[PDB]
Design an enzyme around this catalytic site. Structure first.
Site, PDB file in Angstrom:
ATOM      1  N   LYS B  19      12.635  30.587   9.227  1.00 57.33           N
ATOM      2  CA  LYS B  19      11.340  31.213   8.962  1.00 57.33           C
ATOM      3  C   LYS B  19      11.151  32.503   9.742  1.00 57.33           C
ATOM      4  CE  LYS B  19       7.751  28.549   9.217  1.00 57.33           C
ATOM      5  NZ  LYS B  19       6.903  27.383   9.632  1.00 57.33           N
ATOM      6  N   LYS B  21      13.401  34.394  11.076  1.00 56.47           N
ATOM      7  CA  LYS B  21      14.386  35.356  10.566  1.00 56.47           C
ATOM      8  C   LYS B  21      13.903  36.035   9.283  1.00 56.47           C
ATOM      9  CE  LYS B  21      18.544  33.243  12.584  1.00 56.47           C
ATOM     10  NZ  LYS B  21      19.325  34.464  12.866  1.00 56.47           N
ATOM     11  N   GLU B  39       6.796  38.974   0.080  1.00 59.21           N
ATOM     12  CA  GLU B  39       5.372  38.933   0.406  1.00 59.21           C
ATOM     13  C   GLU B  39       5.100  37.863   1.462  1.00 59.21           C
ATOM     14  OE1 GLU B  39       3.267  41.137  -0.354  1.00 59.21           O
ATOM     15  OE2 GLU B  39       1.248  40.315  -0.160  1.00 59.21           O
ATOM     16  N   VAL B  45      10.051  20.505   6.019  1.00 58.93           N
ATOM     17  CA  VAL B  45      10.994  19.396   5.974  1.00 58.93           C
ATOM     18  C   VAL B  45      10.362  18.249   5.205  1.00 58.93           C
ATOM     19  CG1 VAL B  45      12.219  17.619   7.325  1.00 58.93           C
ATOM     20  CG2 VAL B  45      12.207  20.018   8.090  1.00 58.93           C
ATOM     21  N   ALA B  55      15.696   9.232  -2.857  1.00 61.65           N
ATOM     22  CA  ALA B  55      16.989   8.612  -2.641  1.00 61.65           C
ATOM     23  C   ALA B  55      17.140   7.430  -3.586  1.00 61.65           C
ATOM     24  CB  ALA B  55      17.153   8.171  -1.191  1.00 61.65           C
ATOM     25  N   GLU B 125      17.662  24.382   1.415  1.00 59.72           N
ATOM     26  CA  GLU B 125      17.450  24.991   0.104  1.00 59.72           C
ATOM     27  C   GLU B 125      16.467  26.157   0.234  1.00 59.72           C
ATOM     28  OE1 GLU B 125      14.759  23.349  -3.082  1.00 59.72           O
ATOM     29  OE2 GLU B 125      16.727  22.725  -3.852  1.00 59.72           O
TER      30      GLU B 125
END
Lengths: 191, 183, 188, 189
Positions: B19, B21, B39, B45, B55, B125
């Site tokens: 984030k 970065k 923007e 998580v 799962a 992702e």
């Protein structure tokens, strides 16, 4: 010039206090929060001076300017705006002194609800009441207004007609998106 | 389940590192000051509950959860459709992680997280979307939750109508951008 | 003057990235004892950059060689935590350590300098970042010493200087009693 | 247990609002010496509320009378700053002071006050008790350690460790005394 930065200190602190307060609304709700997110900003000195010279402001009453300090509250649905408005009117940690409804809109398509509060800031030397502008917008309104602001800056207030026509179409498209969203919300609510 | 909170620690840290970065990209621009292709940036998580549930719907044994590509996720929101390719290319060029998959546009990166006991490569992702698409997609996701994956026909019609309106908005914005750039 | 803030942009971003990384260490620990209490970071103001440039005679085309334009400070509870943090930093692969100096072995502080491979829009920029590791008591004394030296423009009166010296000795004894508490518990 | 986190929501919000408020004091001062070095805040964990809920004789019916579910800590460089911060807090109009206790006057040093904070909620106002402690940095260091040890040893530190903790409190006190003399000397400008 740090006389400026000393002048703006209370405005910055009012904004930070109000940001944490207003962000607490969404937290309290985690059903559907009427607030998606909250931003705040103190006007840069240049922008204060520019607007002061554009609207008849001698530098000794700049403190009359209502939007030196500003917050923006973004909502998912148009009906969320009335809900947030009513919350703000009920708060006792400031008082509402003005309002204006561009949702109830401007020639180019600007959509936003504005209110101005008087915030009783606690300082080292006692109390200082500062004016803070609070705007309430849907996400789509905020998106459109951000683009319009950028274009007005890029073109120094003179957007070419070909771009302005399209900007106006975008405002209608944003408005239609909000309408479709409103229908979704209302239909879910006929539960 | 403190087993869980310990399992998720690296994922959470990778998200926080990524984030800061990615939020730095916009900062780099708006000094500049021209148009940032980003923007804003969000990250999350997946909650213990939602991991288990997903799962069990694509039949994933509890020792195979770490293969899941979206335990950690980021979302990058752009003003214009043309920004998405610009952001995509920036991410493929970064040397502080590797892109291992791609397909809203989504990609998956492998992030070399520094931990106290050494390195841990974690899958994260990254979805890239226009603001207008994100708005529609957030509502669709919520309704999919409220109706447990079977949205009623009177709501789904309206969701489709909203999707079209979002599309029309992105198209007008794209036309605005196209006119400006031929300066 | 706009050239300056564009020059400092990468330094600011390096600091923000390193802060989030280093704050993760304590998170990883929190049940056990974190060797890190907290983390601060700062980019040196242009004013302070120029003034140091003029005291160590640095041509403005050579300022980027300055090691502490970007800086972090790591504060630890115990003297022994400092070695633990040092070892963690030397083991990390998301930067490289290029220099260090140990004033712990009245100013007390451990310094190291890292080269951080910042990802920018136009590619990579390797930036020097100073990281100091200090006990709480060390940081307290050093903060006061720095303030007085600013207030007195580098010429502290003897009456204040004697007390500052006694204060550093008191800070050092405080750390010693704390170390003894740690040494005993550890002997479990 | 979700009743717990709904119960603690106002307390968390009160702490976050007061953190930004109190951190504004230092900002206001920077130029000059700020009487505040930093500010932290904490809501007590469910476990710790309950355990304290009656090893100290409190029915869960009346948990809200507890003064320190919400807590803030204000850290100062100098002992003389504590009095300055105290006077600043008594003068503020965005809450009211309802109690106080003074350990500046185990080796524990800290000044405590308790405020009633008028939290604006969606359902109106909620007045919540928030404990504010004011400490020097050196005091806070020592107290942080004792608290950690009290946790490690479940509230009774063995004396061979407790003796040293007392020697440590005395070492911190001596550091604060020299700093006070430094402050006391500089001000004689």
């Amino acid at each position: 010039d740090d006389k400026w930065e000393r002048f703006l200190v209370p405005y910055r602190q009012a904004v930070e206090e109000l940001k944490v307060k207003l962000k607490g609304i969404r937290t309290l709700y985690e059903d559907h929060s009427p607030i998606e997110f909250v931003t705040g900003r103190v006007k840069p000195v240049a922008s204060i001076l520019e607007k002061a010279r554009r609207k008849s402001i001698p530098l000794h009453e700049i403190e009359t300017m209502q939007d030196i300090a500003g917050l923006r509250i973004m909502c998912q649905f148009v009906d969320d705006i009335q809900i947030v408005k009513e919350m703000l009117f009920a708060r006792k940690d400031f008082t509402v002194v003005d309002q204006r409804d561009y949702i109830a809109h401007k020639e180019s398509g600007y959509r936003s609800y504005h209110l101005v509060v008087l915030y009783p800031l606690q300082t080292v030397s006692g109390e200082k009441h500062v004016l803070v502008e609070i705007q309430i917008r849907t996400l789509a309104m905020n998106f459109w207004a951000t683009i319009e602001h950028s274009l007005n800056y890029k073109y120094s207030g003179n957007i070419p007609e070909k771009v302005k026509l399209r900007l106006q179409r975008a405002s209608e498209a944003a408005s239609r998106l909000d309408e479709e969203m409103s229908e979704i919300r209302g239909e879910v609510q006929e539960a």
